[PDB]
Design a protein around this motif. Structure first.
Motif, PDB file in Angstrom:
ATOM      1  N   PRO A 190       7.240  -2.339   8.716  1.00 41.65           N
ATOM      2  CA  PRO A 190       7.077  -3.888   8.964  1.00 41.65           C
ATOM      3  C   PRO A 190       8.425  -4.463   9.697  1.00 41.65           C
ATOM      4  CG  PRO A 190       6.212  -3.424   6.917  1.00 41.65           C
ATOM      5  CD  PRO A 190       6.747  -2.212   7.160  1.00 41.65           C
ATOM      6  N   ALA A 220       7.826  -9.811   2.867  1.00 43.90           N
ATOM      7  CA  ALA A 220       6.843  -8.317   2.005  1.00 43.90           C
ATOM      8  C   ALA A 220       5.711  -8.786   1.321  1.00 43.90           C
ATOM      9  CB  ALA A 220       7.923  -7.742   1.258  1.00 43.90           C
ATOM     10  N   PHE A 240       4.499  -9.281   6.455  1.00 43.56           N
ATOM     11  CA  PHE A 240       4.883  -7.821   6.740  1.00 43.56           C
ATOM     12  C   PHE A 240       3.606  -7.119   7.172  1.00 43.56           C
ATOM     13  CE2 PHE A 240       9.284  -6.747   4.760  1.00 43.56           C
ATOM     14  CZ  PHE A 240       9.811  -7.519   5.839  1.00 43.56           C
ATOM     15  N   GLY A 241       2.604  -7.173   6.169  1.00 46.01           N
ATOM     16  CA  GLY A 241       1.277  -6.842   6.181  1.00 46.01           C
ATOM     17  C   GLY A 241       0.494  -7.137   7.289  1.00 46.01           C
ATOM     18  N   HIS A 244       2.666   0.714   2.472  1.00 51.16           N
ATOM     19  CA  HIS A 244       2.179  -0.337   1.792  1.00 51.16           C
ATOM     20  C   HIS A 244       0.464  -0.096   1.795  1.00 51.16           C
ATOM     21  CE1 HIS A 244       5.835  -1.541   3.844  1.00 51.16           C
ATOM     22  NE2 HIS A 244       6.102  -1.423   2.908  1.00 51.16           N
ATOM     23  N   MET A 245       0.329   1.037   1.547  1.00 55.42           N
ATOM     24  CA  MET A 245      -1.263   1.532   1.184  1.00 55.42           C
ATOM     25  C   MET A 245      -2.151   1.257   2.564  1.00 55.42           C
ATOM     26  SD  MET A 245      -1.599   2.677  -1.655  1.00 55.42           S
ATOM     27  CE  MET A 245      -1.513   4.210  -1.030  1.00 55.42           C
ATOM     28  N   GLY A 246      -1.332   1.277   3.788  1.00 51.66           N
ATOM     29  CA  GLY A 246      -2.133   1.211   5.001  1.00 51.66           C
ATOM     30  C   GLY A 246      -2.036  -0.148   5.640  1.00 51.66           C
ATOM     31  N   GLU A 247      -1.591  -1.070   4.785  1.00 57.48           N
ATOM     32  CA  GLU A 247      -1.199  -2.387   5.480  1.00 57.48           C
ATOM     33  C   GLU A 247      -2.668  -3.027   5.593  1.00 57.48           C
ATOM     34  OE1 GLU A 247       1.718  -3.206   5.391  1.00 57.48           O
ATOM     35  OE2 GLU A 247       2.806  -1.647   6.209  1.00 57.48           O
ATOM     36  N   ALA A 248      -3.459  -2.943   4.345  1.00 59.64           N
ATOM     37  CA  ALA A 248      -4.762  -3.240   4.147  1.00 59.64           C
ATOM     38  C   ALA A 248      -6.055  -2.694   5.000  1.00 59.64           C
ATOM     39  CB  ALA A 248      -4.998  -4.774   4.339  1.00 59.64           C
ATOM     40  N   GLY A 275       5.807   0.141  -2.018  1.00 57.65           N
ATOM     41  CA  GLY A 275       5.536  -1.344  -2.667  1.00 57.65           C
ATOM     42  C   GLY A 275       4.238  -1.321  -3.552  1.00 57.65           C
ATOM     43  N   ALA A 278       2.585   0.511  -6.235  1.00 63.00           N
ATOM     44  CA  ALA A 278       2.623   1.542  -7.419  1.00 63.00           C
ATOM     45  C   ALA A 278       1.337   1.483  -8.306  1.00 63.00           C
ATOM     46  CB  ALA A 278       4.023   1.454  -8.203  1.00 63.00           C
TER      47      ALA A 278
END
Ligand SMILES: [Ca+2]
Ligand SMILES: [Ca+2]
Ligand SMILES: [Cl-]
Ligand SMILES: [Cl-]
Ligand SMILES: [Cl-]
Ligand SMILES: [Cl-]
Ligand SMILES: [Cl-]
Ligand SMILES: [Cl-]
Ligand SMILES: [Cl-]
Ligand SMILES: [Cl-]
Ligand SMILES: [Cl-]
Ligand SMILES: [Cl-]
Lengths: 349, 351
Positions: free
Chosen positions: B189, B208, B212-213, B241-245, B290, B292
């Protein structure tokens, strides 16, 4: 494969994010595009739906305009028992002339109420308002609840680039809590201050920009403390929560970091975590997301009582989606909440 | 139950942290210079005005850890059982710099600095190169130099460069180079450009927490929809970040992408050879930096395949021993857990 009304499968199908239009309001959008007062999002969105000769756009416009036999036939054909109806985004929110906005919203609300009076077992109404005039909107929230039989209101995200966390818009929330009704924050295109990079890639609409705009709007309301000010207030959003349930761990982690470090004037301590608000003050529908893994994820995060079925007719009218929802690997009891009884509770049907 | 987080893999896996940041003092000094002289964009003012000058406990510790590429960083890794860290110059790198010679010079020095540190701690530090997309041809040469001379395993680009996105034809030489070296691109990001940031910045959402996402998910999505993976079928793009949603939005992405393509609504949204889901399974790789959070990890493993989801700490922005303990104790098979912490990264970064 036949989809039937009547609840024989164990539940009614109540669709909770369903759209209509009025010809005179669509005509205002066309006027604004023609005279150059339409924002980039209106040009993109309504330039397409109101003018494209594509099959998708032309059928959406025809279906949006119908509040009678044709709509009922489309519901019957997909076994939809009841539809919760709202004036299609962006409503009268972009209109520069306040008198015109209030007049046309009044007319759209009266038109919807007439349709619900004709089909009281099939149509449920949500009022439209003009947040550019918060006290008038408060009056209309009351009129919708007291005179028109409406169950809440839908606001189409920002009004001319302004968001509902501003103190200016407080009368809207005050009135909602007075009538004890939910607010549905439906998407709109981003305002001109934000839309450019999405527009240039074709991402300004339902594919992406809608989720950005609406998730941002819900989040900023949570972080301004709207639910500490109004603990009874319920806000509904579609599209599986506009990604917020999936972002939840990161939302709470970074929110806590920002609060503790005093980084931002408008991010001060809240009485609950963001997770806490999702569980007590936010409700989600699956409009546009007929997808079992995402639904189940959201049910686990927020509680299965807080997730409702929505079709998003006529923007996403797909019989196979209804079949897929009927067929999910969920208990009969969970399915009944998802299709029927959650909506009956939260909209007070 | 133990509070012990040990290096050495006795849990049954090494912990390889795949999105870890460092800074150089001279580059942070350039951000401060740009803030002072008014050439910094709003994102830089917000982000680096904060991290470089806030007296907050969080910002001050972050800046100290970012600048260390030696014994303190190793001690911090040891204290959280992190065996290896994949390191990249912290966002926005040299991307916002208007002086092309300064950008290339500072990136070269940052790359050489990182390479020296990796040579000193070769069992602990792995490098990703930084580039200057303002100059795509130089960037292509630097991708080659990092692969051949510096031992880097890929590059990290900090999303947009001065408001421009990598789907523009201008940036093509970067992709040609990545395919030539067969290395992944990590799109990390950054703050949104001035054309997009205003409403998020007002609410404190530009960083963040949210912006960022938005920025990074938009960037990956626009690369998929321009057909980057039809042009370069071997190309792997990693995001954190888990694929940015995007994995959570997948059903809606595909439905509305098809609707757009079919209705010929947009010039830059033409037919693709695969669905968006297809590209997630063959060309996109995700880390949990980010995030967990077991439900989100497992969701992402289901959508993309358990081979395509990797552990990352996001040190030092998110240095939390309790997060490592939560990840270690997930209700996941030993085989899946070892892919997540170790062997996926070994494969995709060619460790
Ligand atoms: Ca809708
Ligand atoms: Ca990071
Ligand atoms: Cl009146
Ligand atoms: Cl305010
Ligand atoms: Cl759209
Ligand atoms: Cl706190
Ligand atoms: Cl709480
Ligand atoms: Cl070593
Ligand atoms: Cl181009
Ligand atoms: Cl941040
Ligand atoms: Cl290729
Ligand atoms: Cl079409």
């Amino acid at each position: 494969q036949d989809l039937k009304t009547g609840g024989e499968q164990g539940y009614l199908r109540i669709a909770t994010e369903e759209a209509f239009a009025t010809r005179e309001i669509i005509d205002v959008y066309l006027r604004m595009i023609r005279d150059g007062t339409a924002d980039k999002g209106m040009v993109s969105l309504w330039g397409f739906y109101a003018q494209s000769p594509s099959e998708r756009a032309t059928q959406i416009l025809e279906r949006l305009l119908d509040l009678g036999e044709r709509r009922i036939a489309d519901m019957d054909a997909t076994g939809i028992d009841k539809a919760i109806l709202a004036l299609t985004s962006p409503g009268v929110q972009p209109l520069h002339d306040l008198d015109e906005a209030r007049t046309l919203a009044t007319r759209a609300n009266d038109t919807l109420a007439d349709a619900c009076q004709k089909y009281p077992d099939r149509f449920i109404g949500m009022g439209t308002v003009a947040p550019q005039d918060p006290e008038w909107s408060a009056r209309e929230i009351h009129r919708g609840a007291r005179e028109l039989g409406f169950k809440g209101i839908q606001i189409n995200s920002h009004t001319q680039g302004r968001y509902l966390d501003e103190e200016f818009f407080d009368p809207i929330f005050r009135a909602l809590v007075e009538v004890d009704q939910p607010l549905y924050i439906h998407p709109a295109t981003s305002p001109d201050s934000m839309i450019d990079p999405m527009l240039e890639a074709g991402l300004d609409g339902a594919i992406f920009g809608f989720g950005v705009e609406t998730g941002m709007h819900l989040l900023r309301l949570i972080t301004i403390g709207i639910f500490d000010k109004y603990p009874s207030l319920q806000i509904m959003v579609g599209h599986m929560g506009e990604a917020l349930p999936y972002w939840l761990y990161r939302l709470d982690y970074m929110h806590q970091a920002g609060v503790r470090s005093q980084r931002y004037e408008r991010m001060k301590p809240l009485k609950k975590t963001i997770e806490g608000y999702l569980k007590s003050n936010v409700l989600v529908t699956n409009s546009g997301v007929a997808w079992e893994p995402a639904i189940k994820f959201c049910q686990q995060v927020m509680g299965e009582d807080r997730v409702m079925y929505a079709m998003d007719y006529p923007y996403q009218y797909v019989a196979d989606e209804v079949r897929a929802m009927d067929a999910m690997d969920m208990s009969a009891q969970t399915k009944k909440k998802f299709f029927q009884t959650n909506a009956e509770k939260w909209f007070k049907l």
